[PDB]
Amino acid sequence: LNQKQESAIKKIDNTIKNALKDHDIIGTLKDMDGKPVPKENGGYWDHMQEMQNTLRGLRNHADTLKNVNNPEAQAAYGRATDAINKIESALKGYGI
Amino acid sequence: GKIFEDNSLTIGHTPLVRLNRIGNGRILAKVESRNPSFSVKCRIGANMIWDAEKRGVLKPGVELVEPTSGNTGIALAYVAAARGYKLTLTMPETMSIERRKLLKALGANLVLTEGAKGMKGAIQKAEEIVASNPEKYLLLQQFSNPANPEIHEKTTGPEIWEDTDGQVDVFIAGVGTGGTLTGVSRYIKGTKGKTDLISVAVEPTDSPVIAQALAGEEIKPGPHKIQGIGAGFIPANLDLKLVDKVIGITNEEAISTARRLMEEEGILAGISSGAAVAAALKLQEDESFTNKNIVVILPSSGERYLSTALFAD
Amino acid sequence: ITLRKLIGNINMTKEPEQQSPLELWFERIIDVPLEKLTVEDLCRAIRQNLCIDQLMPRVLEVLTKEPLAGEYYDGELIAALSTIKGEDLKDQKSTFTQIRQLINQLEPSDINDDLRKDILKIN
Structure with a gap:
């Protein structure tokens, strides 16, 4: 009923909510459509790889807090799954 | 003769083409861009x-x-x-x-x-x-309309049966809505009683929710580049009881295999076609499948994606 | 030394109002020399295949002080290194193996364990 470094992980969810910009999602989708942003060297920037990284952090931190019997921690968990749902909802069914 | 009364009645009867330079000669590609x-x-x-x-x-x-x-x-x-x-x-x-x-x-x-x-x-x-x-x-x-798999039980399935004289052993199809795999399996396994048939679902490695569903794992989708499949959930038109095996394909296996289809076989192919073929090739490195007839669905033509990264060299 | 010195500006030339988040980000770190790149910047530059060769020394030092360095999650730097193609280890091929050693000596990990495995199948 009291926190430890689950603190260091509740902070990381909320500040990861400056990595859910509109153009972060829209770049992910255009990668899905096969239109990644070209570099001049040849090859592409990979915006959907950044989105996979963001999902991984959020998913990991939500697991950290999943069964922590504490109100502050359960609030951060709901925010992490609201954000995961926000991303999943954009992609599910896309391109079909 | 046959005069179609409108264009919707022209569906199906798509060719089954043997892959000669890809695989061992036993991969049969059904070209659904026709x-x-x-x-x-x-x-x-x-x-x-x-x-x-x-x-x-x-x-x-x-x-x-x-x-x-x-x-x-x-x-x-x-x-x-x-x-x-x-x-x-x-x-x-x-x-x-x-x-x-x-x-x-x-x-x-x-x-x-x-x-x-x-x-x-x-x-x-x-x-x-x-x-x-x-x-x-x-x-x-x-995703839920049973008229989706119904047409594959009434058309796509029968065409595969007739064209192969029943000697299809494996059926491979990438899963978007699930209708193709469901109906084709449902016809060959149910209506014709070939319960031997091995039905293979293909999905992306970066959003492998069918594999998660059959392990009892929680469903955790992600972005992928195999356009047309990989919905990120198990659609109602996917009957998991009929899926014998699920193969995840990476973005880069699908792109290059699609490009192999175009350059080595003269079959214009999208990413989802390259992925289904890539799954057939992975099945054939298991020697238990070395002498089986493998029918693979090729869902779309590469010319629809002429603007995409599919064409980068 | 900076990313501009190694590869120049690999952005398609366009005005910032027309630039994607990674194009923008690259212009913010291109003049930042390697030794001061934040951990977040380091992971992303690896993920985005930005002269990984010359980044290894910096990665080697960030991990010695903190083997699970990362911004978005612990182990992110190892996760990024998991994405390296061995062929682009030109002159730092030696510095990489020094890193692999530090990485192959640990206790607590999870979905990271496959990344640590994937690191060891690149040569």
Whole structure:
């Protein structure tokens, strides 16, 4: 009923909510459509790889807090799954 | 002779072509871009509207509505044009100008939704449109409509049976809505009683939700580049009881295998076609499948994606 | 030394109002020399295949002080290194193996364990 470094992980969810910009999602989708942003060297920037990284952090931190019997921690968990749902909802069914 | 009464009735009877330079010579590719709107979805665009007519729900004044950013939208567009229906497609605003032009040319009405809301925003708007007059609008619901797998049980399946004289041993199909795999399996395993058939679902490694579903794991989807499959959930039209095996394909295996199909076989191929073939090749490195007849679905042609990273060398 | 010195500006030339988040980000770190790149910047530059060769020394030092360095999650740097193609280890091929050693000596990990495995199948 009291926190430890689950603190260091509740902070990381909320500040990861400056990595859910509109153009972060829209770049992910255009990668899905096969239109990644070209570099001049040849090859592409990979915006959907950044989105996979963001999902991984959020998913990991939500697991950290999943069964922590504490109100502050359960609030951060709901925010992490609201954000995961926000991303999943954009992609599910896309391109079909 | 045969004179078709409109373009929707021309679906199917797509060729089964042996792959000569890819694999050992036992991979059979069914080229579903040989279809009125040049994808496998042509079949479900037709039958889903035929079924709606047969059910009586589609009547004078009733209009069609579906959310889709993919080949289902093209399939519904040509059928509605062929049979005199009004179609509204809801879809994200990330859709290209060229894709909008193709649909408008087929007479479809387009509703573009907020890009960051992705597909759910397009799904929501379609539901709000039908809610504004449920008697005027009808939702096709490609993921749940059993008319989706019904046409593959009535057409795609039988064609594979007839063309192979029943000697198909493995059937491989990437899963978007699940209809292709479900109906084809359902015909060959049920109607013809070949329970021996090994049915293989193909999905992306970066969104492997079918494999998660059969392990009892929690469903954790992600972005992937194999356009057309990999919905990120288990659609109602996917009957998991019929899936014998699921193979995840990486983005880069699908691109290069699709490019192999074009350069080595002369078959224009999209990413989802390269992925299904890549799964056949992975199955053939197991020596238990070395002498089996493998039928693979090739859902679309690479020329539809001429603007994409599929063409980078 | 900076990323501009190694590879120049690999952005398609366009005005910032027309640039994607990674194009923008690259212009913010291109003049930042390697030794001061934040951990977040380091992971992303690896993920985005930005002269990984010359980044290894910096990665080697960030991990010695903190083997699970990362911004978005612990182990992110190892996760990024998991994405390296061995062929682009030109002159730092030696510095990489020094890193692999530090990585092959640990106790607590999870979905990271496959990344640590994937690191060891690149040569």
